[PDB]
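Last lecture ended with a question: if I hand you only a sequence, what can you say about the shape of the protein? Today we answer it with a concrete record. The protein is dakd. Below, first the input exactly as provided, then the predicted structure, then a couple of comments.
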Amino acid sequence: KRPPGFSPF
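The predicted structure:
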């Protein structure tokens, strides 16, 4: 999954 605190692409 996408790690929290990083830019969503």
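Comments.
1. The CA atoms of residues 1 and 9 lie 12 Å apart.
2. The chain has no helices and no strands.
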